[PDB]
Amino acid sequence: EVVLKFHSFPPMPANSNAKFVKPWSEKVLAESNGEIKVEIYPAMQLGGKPPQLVDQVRDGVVDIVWTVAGYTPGRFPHLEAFELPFMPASAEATSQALQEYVDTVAASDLKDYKVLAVFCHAPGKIHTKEKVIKSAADLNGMKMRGPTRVITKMLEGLGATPVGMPVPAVAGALSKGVIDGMVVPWEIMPSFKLHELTKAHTTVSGSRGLYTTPFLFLMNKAKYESLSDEHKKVIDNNAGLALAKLAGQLWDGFEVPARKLALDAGGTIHSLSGGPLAEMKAAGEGLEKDWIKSANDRGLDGAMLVKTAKDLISKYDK
Ligand SMILES: O=C(O)c1cccc(O)c1
């Protein structure tokens, strides 16, 4: 018998716990004949703040984490390419792209971990208390939360005043008037009542969504290496590209009930097209250009990484 401590920041009802890590742990339990037991600690129940999850798993404080890569700026620089404006297709396609990217050109970002999967949410949407966002200009003066440095820079480039914070802080920042809105996909919102606190929602039409942000599902390397050959095989049968594909499929599906909750609560949903959409995409090109230069400055071939990311997304877009 092996006990593995899983740690993450969302509360127990959040999809990442209840509909991803919990069934993963049940499949791992079943396929190891009750021998590999994951103990799930949501809501930072083993201590620390969300950016520390990667340190905890790296150092063996815990054995497995689910987190947002960009909650620790600069630590996973290759993955930033997938956060650039208008990169994501479905979570299913974009998650497989992320995993193959990490398996190949971006492996150095995660060399200190056992990678279970890297994947992402369905494209994020724009949420405000009441003001409909029809164009970039409607964001002028609005304090808008994003999850990572790349996404806050996108918000600045669309005219907003960016504020960064992990998602559990958003509701309080809204109710206290510290932010006027945020970007998140639908799926995370009900776990924090965010569809009650924002009634105006904007998405984009077409085949590339506003943004996504990579999730990391990681195991401590030494702990993985200590497992028996048979236990490694159970873990690996529940890791890699197949898991990233399943995760992306799940995250696409998670949008559906969450969107319905938001509209049932009195929300509006507006979908940018035409001129307003083109204006946002043109603004995004500026961030893409500056990101490529910033990757160059950090020793990466920024142009090659952006091309690779785009090509992998389209490869898996079926
Ligand atoms: O925007 C985020 O920080 C976030 C965190 C967890 C799940 C998710 O869909 C989004």
SS (H, E, C) the chain: CEEEEEEECCCCCCHHHHHHHHHHHHHHHHHCCCCEEEEEECCCCCCCCHHHHHHHHHHCCCCEEEEEHHHCCCCCHHHHHHHCCCCCCCHHHHHHHHHHHHHCCCHHHHCCEEEEEEEECCCCEEEECCCCCCCHHHHCCCEEEECCHHHHHHHHHCCCEEEECCHHHHHHHHHCCCCCEEEECCCCCHHHCHHHHCCEEEEECCCCCCCCCEEEEEEEHHHHHHCCHHHHHHHHCCCCHHHHHHHHHHHHHHHHHHHHHHHHCCCEEEEECHHHHHHHHHHHHHHHHHHHHHHHHCCCCHHHHHHHHHHHHHHCCC
The one-letter amino acid at 85: P
Experimental determination technique: X-ray
Separation between Cα atoms, residue 205 and residue 306, nearest integer Å? 22
Find tokens 């507006």 and name the residue.
Answer: 270
Ligand 1 geometric centre to CA of 17 (Å): 12
- Resolution given for this structure, in angstroms: 1.3
Burial of 3 (0-12, 13-18, 19+ CB in 10 A): exposed
Ligand 1 geometric centre to CA of 271 (Å): 21
Separation between Cα atoms, residue 155 and residue 186, nearest integer Å? 18
> Residue 155 is encoded by which pair of tokens?
């918000």
Separation between Cα atoms, residue 276 and residue 254, nearest integer Å? 27
List 206's β-bridge partners, or say none: none
The one-letter amino acid at 122: A
Contact of 228 with 159, CB cutoff 8 Å: no
Q: Whose CA is nearest to atom 4 of ligand 1?
A: 167
Separation between Cα atoms, residue 139 and residue 156, nearest integer Å? 9
Question: What domains does the chain contain, in order, with CATH numbers?
Answer: 1-318 (3.40.190.170)
How far, in Å, are 30, 77, 84, 292, 310 from residue 283 at the CA level? 49, 22, 11, 15, 18
> Residue 182 is encoded by which pair of tokens?
């945020």
**84 Cβ closer than 6 Å to some ligand 1 atom:** no
**187 Cβ closer than 6 Å to some ligand 1 atom:** yes
Site to probe by mutation for ligand 1, drawn from 15, 17, 21, 121 as the one with most ligand atoms within 8 Å of Cβ, is 121
Separation between Cα atoms, residue 31 and residue 47, nearest integer Å? 30
Closest atom of ligand 1 to 187 CA is: 9
List 115's β-bridge partners, or say none: 218
Burial of 252 (0-12, 13-18, 19+ CB in 10 A): buried
Q: Whose CA is nearest to atom 6 of ligand 1?
A: 188
The two beta strands, 143-146 and 181-184, are: parallel
> Residue 47 is encoded by which pair of tokens?
């201590």
Q: Is the dihedral of CA 115, 252, 22, 315 positive or negative?
A: negative
Separation between Cα atoms, residue 166 and residue 301, nearest integer Å? 29
From the list 68, 128, 136, 73, the residue with the least C-alpha distance to 98 is 68
From the list 114, 90, 91, 92, the residue with the least C-alpha distance to 102 is 114
Separation between Cα atoms, residue 300 and residue 237, nearest integer Å? 32
Phi, psi of 146 (to 5 degrees): -130, 165
Separation between Cα atoms, residue 183 and residue 212, nearest integer Å? 10
Separation between Cα atoms, residue 244 and residue 250, nearest integer Å? 10
Site to probe by mutation for ligand 1, drawn from 8, 44, 125, 184 as the one with most ligand atoms within 8 Å of Cβ, is 184
Separation between Cα atoms, residue 194 and residue 174, nearest integer Å? 9
Residues 6+ apart with CB under 8 A from 199: 129, 130, 265, 266, 267, 268
* Edge-to-edge order in the sheet of strand 2-8: 36-41, 2-8, 64-68, 214-220, 113-120
Crossing angle for the helix pair 91-103 and 241-264, to the nearest 10 degrees: 150
Closest atom of ligand 1 to 151 CA is: 1
